[PDB]
């Protein structure tokens, strides 16, 4: 219902206000799983800082269980700079964050307890295209 290109909303908690709602009256529908929103799904969407873009005009949200569905496909296929040296420090003007990226595995911009979690293992780090991804608490063990 939102076809404005330049006025595109980004965050669901940000969209929570102009939809005539305080915190808990948003009701939208997903795309990739084709279901209604879930409170836990809303919390997880807020836990990864996505950016809602309109699908065929209608802006729709994204679920939680679909996290490792359209992201696992691009962690072993394309590869580039995979070092913690200067491999992304000089090719661009500003080198990088402390250890923050736009994550693909943990999928939030930076988990708190993920700086050394990968470093404790050293088993084929998935530095994809130069992005230091980690692991989240929702996918720690085999579930």
């Amino acid at each position: 219902m939102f076809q404005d290109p330049q006025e595109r909303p980004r965050k669901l908690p940000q969209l929570c206000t102009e939809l005539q709602t305080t915190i808990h009256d948003i009701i939208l529908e997903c795309v990739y799983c084709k279901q209604q929103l879930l409170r836990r799904e809303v919390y997880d969407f807020a836990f990864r800082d996505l950016c809602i873009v309109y699908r065929d005009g209608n802006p729709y949200a994204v679920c939680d269980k679909c996290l490792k569905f359209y992201s696992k496909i691009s962690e072993y296929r394309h590869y580039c700079y995979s070092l913690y040296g200067t491999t992304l420090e000089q090719q661009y003007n500003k080198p990088l964050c402390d250890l923050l990226i736009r994550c693909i595995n943990c999928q939030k911009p930076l988990c708190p307890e993920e700086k050394q979690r990968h470093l404790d293992k050293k088993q084929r780090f998935h530095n994809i295209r130069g992005r230091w991804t980690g692991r989240c608490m929702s996918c720690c063990r085999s579930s």
């Binding site: 990739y32 950016c51 992201s71 696992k72 496909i73 691009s74 070092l83 491999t87 736009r102």
Partner: protein, 692 residues
């Protein structure tokens, strides 16, 4: 005794006075001491020859009137280079002062170090110190090489190349010691790359002659804009990578049109045929920056090795896809066929391919890149390639057959082109693309006569003077003659702006480039606009839709693959068409025998001699008759795996070779005259029988 220590920098007049004093006193020791003092440090050369430019042009002529100066030069250039390493690793000298590009100029202008005695520790260490240099200094140095005569830049590229050859002959390379773990050869390769970029800038490069990507809204894969959902912006995709120096100069390898020297010259064969790419690809894609990926130099490698790398890319692609799809079926529980089993009929092959391959490609364009396991109806068995090869060849030949009207032939150059003004369906030019991508990926020769224009505009280019001079160079020569025509075209031929345009029925249809094309007379006060407009409209803008569909098919069978720059336009041809050169010694030295017959058999010797009795035309026609293609496979006749088996005893019952496996099961005959007669008859009746 004067120590000459009051002067620390060298100029023309001061060195002239020093030489005059040495001649008057007849003692060269002061000159030797002065030259050693000067060449013992970097700053002495930094201040040397400071103009208040012909000093370097003239002084070096008189340096060589003796012999004792070269012994000092050798140790001076051995000692000086590590100081430059210290002053270049972390000193930022070019950043502090632009007046630093004199040291290596002085070290390199002397065209006499190329004696083999120096090229053991003098020039190799200079190359080691040349490996490190601030990234703008390399470009700035390259400008002067580019703006210079061709002869001397050629001379220095052979001196670097023969240094490379000297080490690769000397040094040993194996699995445990690649051609990259040695720093001297890598540094020499980098400097040769600098000379390469200088030489390509020397040619008439071009960037306006680059057709813009008029891409339609191709069906995207939601995993690309999922990232934009993850929070980023429209990403400058980390797909196609570019050389940093290419960005610096704004010069791409594709931009070259006519170089000063042929690009084949840079190919260092002694290194090239001792290079392994199976693990070089790993060293490249992951981009481990302590080693050099020789693919970053797309000029020092030939067809076979680059093709090996591309095949390895396809193999790792298939590995990754299987690794993903096993867990995809584990969790989502969806069935996918890794084999591209295009199971079709025996006469509806084209339309069955249309209704199956495009459907399997819309779901996943990476499926086209896969391996195909062709299984027809009426026959069964493990398809090792023979059924696939006959499928490919019948597809091409029926498309070559003018029963569809979409592939045309010309006798001037024996090349197969598309229909200039057809009204096809976009699906017709999609199986050509997918089959071509498979042939590039199936390691199978695809009999076709595609000129360079196809392999060029299929790379991201347009076509130019020489590309036009591949199908109809007569129009090329006619316009080249008019280029120097200083007379009045209007008063001589009064030809309008338009000339003609071919169509399906041959009708001279009306086609004016601009308004009133038949009412605007030709003006001789400008010709370059005629040249530009012709090079645009006669070279493109006529097969936009049909070739757009073909190029879309090829790009959707290969989009994510290091194929855009490793292979130039003049290079992917050899992957499918076949090697132009037909050297028989390669076939002799690369021969695999079977059937239980020894290699030292006299019968095989006389069979090979009978083949020798043929000429080049007869040899290639024999190759076409037997293998099915008139050109040698990728790597020529010296890289394939040809099989010679036994059909039976000496008898003229049915001499037949297994065309599916390309095995020449020639019967063993004693008398030579019968063999010659049978071979002549086979040559005369080669493709008229319809067997292949």
């Amino acid at each position: 005794r004067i120590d000459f220590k009051d002067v620390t920098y060298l100029t023309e007049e001061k060195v002239y006075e020093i030489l005059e004093l040495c001649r008057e006193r007849e003692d060269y020791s002061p000159l030797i001491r002065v030259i050693g003092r000067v060449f013992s440090s970097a700053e002495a050369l930094v201040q040397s020859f400071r103009k208040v430019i012909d000093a370097i042009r003239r002084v070096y002529t008189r340096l060589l009137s003796n012999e004792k100066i070269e012994t000092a030069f050798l140790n001076a250039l051995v000692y000086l280079s590590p100081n430059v390493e210290c002053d270049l690793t972390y000193h930022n000298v070019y950043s502090r002062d632009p007046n630093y590009l004199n040291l290596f100029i002085i070290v390199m202008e002397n065209r006499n170090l190329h004696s083999p005695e120096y090229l053991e520790m003098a020039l190799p260490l200079f190359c080691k110190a040349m490996s490190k240099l601030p990234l703008a200094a390399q470009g700035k140095l390259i400008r002067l090489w580019s703006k210079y005569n061709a002869d001397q830049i050629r001379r220095m590229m052979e001196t670097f190349q023969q240094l490379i050859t000297y080490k690769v002959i000397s040094n040993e390379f194996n699995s445990r010691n690649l051609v990259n773990d040695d720093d001297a050869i890598v540094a020499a390769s980098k400097c040769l790359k600098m000379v390469y970029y200088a030489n390509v800038v020397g040619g008439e490069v071009d960037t306006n002659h680059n057709e813009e990507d008029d891409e339609e809204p191709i069906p995207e894969s939601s995993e690309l804009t999922l990232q934009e959902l993850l929070g980023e912006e429209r990403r400058n995709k980390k797909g196609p990578r570019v050389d940093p120096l290419e960005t610096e100069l704004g010069v791409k390898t594709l931009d070259c049109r006519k170089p000063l020297i042929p690009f084949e010259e840079f190919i260092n064969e002694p290194l090239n045929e001792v290079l392994e790419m199976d693990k070089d690809y790993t060293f490249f894609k992951v981009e481990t920056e302590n080693k050099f990926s020789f693919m970053t130099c797309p000029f020092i490698l030939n067809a076979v090795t680059k093709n090996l790398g591309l095949y390895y890319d396809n193999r790792i692609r298939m590995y990754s896809e299987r690794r993903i799809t096993v867990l995809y079926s584990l969790v989502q529980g969806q069935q996918l066929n890794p084999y591209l089993r295009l199971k079709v009929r025996r006469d509806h092959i084209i339309d069955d391919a249309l209704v199956r391959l495009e459907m399997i490609a819309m779901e996943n364009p990476a499926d086209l890149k896969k391996q195909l396991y062709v299984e027809f109806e009426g026959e069964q068995g493990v398809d090792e390639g023979g059924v696939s090869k006959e499928f490919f060849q019948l597809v091409v030949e029926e498309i070559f057959n003018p029963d569809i009207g979409m592939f045309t032939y010309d006798e001037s150059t024996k090349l197969f082109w598309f229909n200039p003004s057809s009204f096809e369906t976009e699906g017709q030019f999609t199986l050509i693309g997918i089959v071509l991508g498979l042939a590039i990926y199936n390691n199978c020769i695809l009999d076709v006569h595609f000129p360079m224009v196809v392999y060029r505009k299929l790379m991201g280019k347009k076509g130019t003077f020489r590309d036009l001079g591949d199908s109809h160079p007569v129009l090329y020569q006619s316009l080249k003659d008019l280029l120097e025509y200083e007379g009045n075209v209007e008063d001589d031929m009064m030809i309008t702006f338009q000339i003609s345009q071919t169509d399906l029925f041959g009708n001279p249809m009306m086609y004016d480039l601009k308004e009133n094309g038949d009412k605007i007379p030709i003006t001789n006060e400008n010709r370059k606009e005629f040249v530009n407009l012709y090079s645009d409209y006669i070279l493109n803008k006529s097969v936009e839709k049909q070739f757009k569909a073909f190029r879309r098919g090829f790009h959707m069978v290969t989009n994510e693959s290091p194929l855009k720059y490793l292979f130039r336009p003049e290079e992917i041809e050899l992957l499918i068409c076949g090697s132009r050169n037909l050297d028989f010694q390669a076939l002799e030295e690369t021969t695999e025998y079977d059937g239980g017959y020894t290699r030292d058999s006299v019968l095989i010797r006389e069979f090979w001699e009978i083949v020798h009795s043929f000429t080049d035309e007869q040899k290639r026609l024999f190759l076409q008759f037997t293998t099915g293609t008139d050109r040698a496979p990728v790597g020529g006749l010296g890289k394939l795996k040809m099989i010679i088996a036994k059909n039976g005893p000496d008898t003229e019952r049915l001499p037949t070779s297994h065309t599916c496996f390309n095995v020449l099961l020639l019967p063993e005959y004693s008398s030579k005259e019968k063999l010659k007669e049978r071979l002549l008859k086979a040559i005369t009746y080669a493709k008229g029988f319809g067997m292949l």
